[PDB]
């Protein structure tokens, strides 16, 4: 069935955004098409430039607390020239009047390719997790030691990540099954009938006059019937599978009081407030629908086998 | 598990009839004769057989390990599973391996609201406040509040998904379909 | 009358992830019908996965709880995305698409609302069976 896509319910133009300078011609998806017919990937949402009518007096102040960064974030207490990379390679440490006091004296190697990138944007309707939606390099104060791992090396745990375990868990499972079915039936039927008949009558008369008569008759018949019936059926089924997961590490992102990246904050700053489903659906695909509060770095493998007879 | 049943039926019937009639009359000479003979036999036969074999097999295996460096730990894992040759050096390496990266085995528990620092700003009120929270937390969401599975399937909770572990002899989700299955037999004559 | 019929069905599936691409798929080739489990490949797989890991278990949390507080319009945008995340999961899914035949599990891969048909059945739309059925004609041949 060539099922078409009834995918054009249009809505009314909403009010223009003064600060964002965008319109919200809305739409909605109704029918996909279950068969080989016309594929329709038409995304929901529409934008348009509009002349702003409101003065746009509302603005984001620079936190009114301390030195503003070059992107919009703020120093809490010690984001000065103390080896704390938050904004850029030399953005925060641009002005260094005092001596470059190191925040930590011990040799602690940076988290290389490990759970450092703890942000993930998995889509429940989509696929495997996405990249990090927030900044995971900034740290608040004194380095928190991570003296664990396979070898003898010290890693760093960012202030955004609340925990980082190095448990090398490992497990596996296997299963098997066998089904068997057999049925046989034999039938045999035989019929036999035999028929024979005789008829003899003789006549003689002699009271010259003489008379002689003799009748003879025979009959032979048999009908043999034979019937044979046989039936046989066999069925077999096998089901077996195995799965294994080699766990490497585990982390738990801090829920509240966490720092974000300049790219995501700019998206939230340049974001509408009149329920723009079009941009929100567009913004939803960029950073996923929901992030991961706790993950498990590692890898798993699985094997599945089926058989039917 | 195995099941076998056999049934054999045989039926045979024979029945025949015999009749002989002969009449001769004599009476000047007159001769009258008569001869009637009847023969009829009947045979009936019937046969039936029943042969049904059924067998079921179930096997399950599971294992787990943790601790030590990843090299020595899983070298023990590969050789323990169906290896049948326990080595002397791998267990000694496992001893030095676990010394570097250990993990919990036995854990004695204690509530967090007892760990709050005393003589703080509002320590006591926050202490009992988290006490109400920790009591509500364990009683807010759990298997107790979810729905019960079928066929005694142990219900678990893994981040919203309230799945139930179904037994070995039974099939997967919702424990609805059995997958024992059941054998069907039709002795009807084939149409074509 | 002599009629014999036999049917056979076999299916196999496997997957793997993590570790460097050299050691990972070296494990893949030897596991599939290899029947000879090596000692060095699993040890190499141990060091391989240490370099490039991947998610196994993932605890989930909504995004609208991650929005920074005390922003310009944080609260109104928070509940606004809350209405969006609720509508998003309920806007397009298998629930709104059409149901397949013969209990075929329906999936959704970027618009294509295909349905996975069982093993004993044939492909798309689960219409044709492909069991097929045996036909017998005892008629005398014309020529
Ligand atoms: C039903 O019939 C099967 C026929 O396969 C029996 O299995 C044996 O089969 C061999 C070869 O076909 C015969 O030589 C044996 O005589 C059969 N065994 C017996 C005991 O007759 C099977 O045993 C029969 N009964 C059941 C319950 O399956
Ligand atoms: C005639 O009679 C004989 C003897 O009783 C019998 O065996 C036979 O079946 C009868 N019918 C014939 C010969 O057709
Ligand atoms: C019935 O007739 C068939 C035909 O030849 C013969 O083979 C068989 O022996 C006969 N049976 C009896 C009981 O006369």
Residue numbers in the entry:
A (entry chain S): 18 to 224, 242 to 343
B (entry chain R): 344 to 535
C (entry chain S): 393 to 535
Give sentences from the paper:
We used 3D classification procedures to computationally isolate two stoichiometrically identical conformations, open and closed, which varied in the extent of β-barrel closure. Although the chasm is sealed in the closed conformation, interfaces mediating the MACPF-rim and transmembrane regions are not flush. The asymmetric region swings back and meets C9 in a noncanonical MAPCF-thrombospondin (C6-TSP3) interaction with limited buried surface area. Despite a contiguous extracellular β-barrel, there remains a gap within the transmembrane pore where the shorter hairpins of C6, C7, and C8 abut those of C9. In the open conformation, the first and terminal C9 are latterly shifted by ~20 Å, while the ring of the closed conformation remains planar. Therefore, conformational flexibility of the assembly may impact local curvature of the membrane. A similar analysis of the C9 oligomer from the closed conformation resulted in a lower resolution map. Using a masked refinement strategy coupled with signal subtraction, we improved the resolution of the asymmetric regions for each conformation to 4.7 Å and 5.9 Å.
The multiprotein membrane attack complex is a bactericidal weapon of the innate immune system that also modulates inflammation and proliferation when formed on self-cells. MAC assembles from soluble complement proteins in an obligate sequential pathway. Previous electron cryo-microscopy (cryoEM) reconstructions of the complex revealed that the final MAC is comprised of 6 polypeptide chains (C5b, C6, C7, C8α, C8β, and C8γ) together with 18 C9 monomers that are arranged in a split-washer configuration. Based on structural similarity with bacterial homologs, the giant (110 Å diameter) β-barrel pore is formed when helical bundles in the Membrane Attack Complex-Perforin (MACPF) domains transform into transmembrane β-hairpins (TMH), although a molecular mechanism for how this occurs is not currently understood.
